[PDB]
Amino acid sequence: HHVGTNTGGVLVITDTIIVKSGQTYDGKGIKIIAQGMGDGSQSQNQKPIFKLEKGANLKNVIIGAPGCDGIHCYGDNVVENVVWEDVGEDALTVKSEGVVEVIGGSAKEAADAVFQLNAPCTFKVKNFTATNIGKLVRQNGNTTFKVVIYLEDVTLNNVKSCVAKSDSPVSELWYHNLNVNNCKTLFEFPSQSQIHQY
Ligand X SMILES: O=C(O)[C@H]1O[C@H](O[C@@H]2[C@H](O)[C@@H](O)[C@@H](O[C@@H]3[C@H](O)[C@H](O)[C@@H](O)O[C@@H]3C(=O)O)O[C@@H]2C(=O)O)[C@H](O)[C@@H](O)[C@H]1O
**Residue 41, C-beta contacts closer than 8 angstroms, at least 6 positions apart:** 88, 89, 111
Residue type at 28 in one-letter notation: K
CB closer to ligand X out of 60 and 84: 84
State which residue has the least CB distance to ligand X.
141
**Rounded to the nearest whole angstrom, what is the least distance from the CB of residue 131 to Ca ion in the complex?**
11
Q: Closest approach of Cβ 111 to ligand X, in Å? A: 9
Residue closest to 90 by CA, chosen among 127, 149, 130: 130
Binding site for Ca ion (CB under 5 A): 42, 69, 86-87, 89-90, 109, 112
DSSP codes of every residue in 1-16: ----TTTT-EEEESSP
Residue 90 contacts ligand X per CB under 6 A: yes
The answer to whether 36 touches 68, Cβ cutoff 8 Å, is no
ω into 66 cis (within 30 of 0): yes
Cα dihedral across residues 140, 25, 124, 170: positive or negative? positive
Name the binder of 31 from ligand X, Ca ion, none, CB < 5-8 A by kind. none
Q: Shortest gap between Cβ of 67 and ligand X (angstroms)?
A: 12
* Least spacing, CB of residue 129 vs ligand X, in Å: 22
List the x/- string, 165-194, binding to ligand X by CB under 6 A.
x-----------------------------
| Residue 158 touches ligand X, criterion: CB under 6 A | no
Instruction: Report the residue number whose CB is nearest to Ca ion.
Output: 112
Computed from CA positions of residues 140, 123, 179, 168, in that sequence, does the dihedral angle turn out positive or negative?
A: positive
Q: How many CA atoms lie within 13 A of 45 on its CB side?
A: 1
Q: If contact means CB under 5 to 8 A according to the sort of partner, which of Ca ion, ligand X, none does residue 140 touch?
A: ligand X
Nearer to ligand X, 153 or 172 (CB): 172
Q: Name the one range near ligand X by CB under 6 A: 19-27, 47-55, 134-142, 172-180.
A: 134-142
Q: How far apart are CA 138 and CA 159, in angstroms?
A: 13
Does residue 93 interact with ligand X by CB under 6 A?
A: yes
Residue numbers of the site for ligand X (CB under 6 A)? 89-90, 93, 112, 116, 118, 138, 140-141, 165
